[PDB]
Amino acid sequence: ATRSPGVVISDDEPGYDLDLFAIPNHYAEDLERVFIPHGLIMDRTERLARDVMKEMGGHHIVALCVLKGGYKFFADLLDYIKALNRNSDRSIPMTVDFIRLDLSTLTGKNVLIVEDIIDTGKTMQTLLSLVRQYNPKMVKVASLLVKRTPRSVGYKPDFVGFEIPDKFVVGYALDYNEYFRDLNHVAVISETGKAKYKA
Amino acid sequence: SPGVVISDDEPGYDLDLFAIPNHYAEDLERVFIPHGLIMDRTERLARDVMKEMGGHHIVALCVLKGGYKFFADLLDYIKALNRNSDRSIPMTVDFIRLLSTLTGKNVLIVEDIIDTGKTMQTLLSLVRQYNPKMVKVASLLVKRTPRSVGYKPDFVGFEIPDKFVVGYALDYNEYFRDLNHVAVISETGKAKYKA
Amino acid sequence: SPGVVISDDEPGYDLDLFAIPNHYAEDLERVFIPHGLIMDRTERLARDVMKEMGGHHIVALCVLKGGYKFFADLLDYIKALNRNSDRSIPMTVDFIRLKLSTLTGKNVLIVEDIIDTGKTMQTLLSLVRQYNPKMVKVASLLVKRTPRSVGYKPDFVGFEIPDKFVVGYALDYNEYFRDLNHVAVISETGKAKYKA
Amino acid sequence: TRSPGVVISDDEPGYDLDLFAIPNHYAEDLERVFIPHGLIMDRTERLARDVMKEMGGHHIVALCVLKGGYKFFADLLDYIKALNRNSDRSIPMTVDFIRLDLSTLTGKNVLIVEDIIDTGKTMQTLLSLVRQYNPKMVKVASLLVKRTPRSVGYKPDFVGFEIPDKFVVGYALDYNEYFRDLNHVAVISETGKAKYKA
């Protein structure tokens, strides 16, 4: 719930062609276009980590990961946060948990909920109400990707990595029928790939 | 077979030989395994896993909560092998709170440290009862301790002396998370960060 | 292909979207290519290089000076491909000064960090060709769309950028901005701040 | 100039080959891995801050000696540039290459970067040639110092690893331009010496 919408990727002109970057060859016909390369994600994630310690560094941080199979972004975000802490000459305690949808550990602490993708946003909103119930000092939501979808409730994430168009993306932290885990770029899935690896 | 064996006669490296956080200067006695050495070993471990379990679909279970870090890096190296194999390979990723889906599947249990070995032996008995095709355990650290039952993981990163270590994936009252290397905690550190 | 094309519509990113050293906050105007984007593109360039001339032994020549980071990273990806090729592939690595008989009959890769007008490379190619090499191709990280270009185009291009003076990654300004890992447009303030 | 760096003892040196990831085409060409790639990186990171605390106050001249190697110089520079990001001032730095315009060294902090020091004759030859251009401060960094009686008694200001007297390859150390894709420092085998002979 802040002004920064993050790195915007418009419907006019999105992403780069597949030939310009290194894609696993078994995914050659399963993707349409690359929206966000792995390294671009890392750079943005590094800035997000500095945004988090800027607004939440005041109290003991509880980093809360959602278990959607996507551990990748949560692990990367935390790595950058730890990188900041090791050069702060104060030893900074931090606890990390996981939620699948005892939380008494959240009382009076800065809670950071980390999400990979936000589409409808009611999965996210549902989690705020449960965490706020345990009376934390503050709750912030980090999201790597926010899709511009008509299924928008109106809820706005605090820390956003990228704002992407309404396409079904896979890669990096997002999978499809447990496929595309070895793909480190965020790319749009094709009709071929959507049918080939269908459940 | 027992992994990289860190003997008892001299225990890793001096603190000033590597870059440790300044606020952990007095809280450590010695560095056993530098971060880079862990990563290079884990890359080989990932190759060993694909060797004995790459036959069928792999369900990788992370034991919560001793440390997520080793699990994250182990799977990163596994995916690296998968994307260069000219073959679309699916993989299940799950976490254990300490589940009947595990029936007839190739299950990989990932632990960051094994001390006595009783936690893992207990976890194994619970998993086998759901009749999995194969269950193997990967452990980053196995300690040489007289308090051990006799359990040995299928995959071992390092065999270390009987000393309380922190860093990389092992914390102490939610401290030392920002420490990359595996180091022995000092008596100062134990008392400074007690609960 | 001309590589990744950065148009002049409204390119780059706001400085607030990425991590930038605080002592460079006022000295930069906009970030064109983040460090990670350079690396992902460079990895692909390494693949392209190890296909048009990466058959056997190559001689990789880095132009001095102007940069070194791009040459180091490009070779790191090349060496990463070689160690998965199931074949021991030797490689010559050396640097060239622009004011050498080894190049005779060799497969030469000239690595450059940026190409503006292109006369430096045209001049460089004409001299190398006189030593009669088996083949000489040029890889460049950046190629600027400038009205000043003679018309030279490299065999391999990383990014095509607007006619703006950029610093970072492998490009400096009076030996400053070396610690800046993103490619960014230097501001008027910084340009005057770090003058020679 | 008396911290010998990470000492690798000689009764049992390094690690077995099967414990780490080694390129398949080098499987028979090596005997023993001394220093894994990641261990080099961690040590190099520490070296980078040793350098910056002594010399790195202001403007330094990073001088690389060309052996066909460059990897260590590039990695050491990367860690140094990583430190200067968290400094609260902009640090200028010049990087150059020399094989044995040197008026540019006068009155500046000169850092000579070496990958391997064996007898040490190369370094003291180079030192005597640099110190006569009157630099404000000239010091030597070396990734590897071999422990050999053939040494002329020269010791570098900054040392990464002190290794036994064996012929090592990998990471910034080639053998007839081979082993460049090997990221670990390993001992070359007899099969390797003949397989990649000139």
Ligand SMILES: Nc1nc2c(ncn2C[C@@H](COCP(=O)(O)O)OC[C@@H](O)P(=O)(O)O)c(=O)[nH]1
């Ligand atoms: N790979 C991929 N997955 C996506 C995409 N968009 C949504 N998802 C999954 C969704 C939860 O999954 C619903 P299900 O399949 O489990 O029923 O995530 C958003 C929810 O958290 P929201 O905020 O409530 O909308 C996408 O573009 N690519």
Ligand SMILES: Nc1nc2c(ncn2C[C@@H](COCP(=O)(O)O)OC[C@@H](O)P(=O)(O)O)c(=O)[nH]1
């Ligand atoms: N950081 C750190 N932690 C250690 C160390 N040795 C043991 N632990 C914790 C122990 C579980 O701790 C129970 P708790 O008291 O924390 O609740 O893990 C081993 C069991 O899984 P085991 O195999 O059954 O013995 C150590 O050297 N360093």
Ligand SMILES: Nc1nc2c(ncn2C[C@@H](COCP(=O)(O)O)OC[C@@H](O)P(=O)(O)O)c(=O)[nH]1
């Ligand atoms: N950092 C930075 N440097 C730039 C830029 N554009 C040009 N240069 C330098 C120029 C050579 O330097 C001339 P000097 O400084 O020695 O006088 O490189 C182009 C020649 O190779 P070209 O192809 O012949 O035009 C730029 O945008 N950023």
Ligand SMILES: Nc1nc2c(ncn2C[C@@H](COCP(=O)(O)O)OC[C@@H](O)P(=O)(O)O)c(=O)[nH]1
């Ligand atoms: N790969 C590899 N190379 C080594 C090793 N030990 C020495 N070298 C080369 C030597 C110069 O090479 C002489 P050449 O054969 O090229 O003529 O470097 C040391 C001189 O700088 P020093 O200090 O004066 O003795 C080693 O263990 N492995």
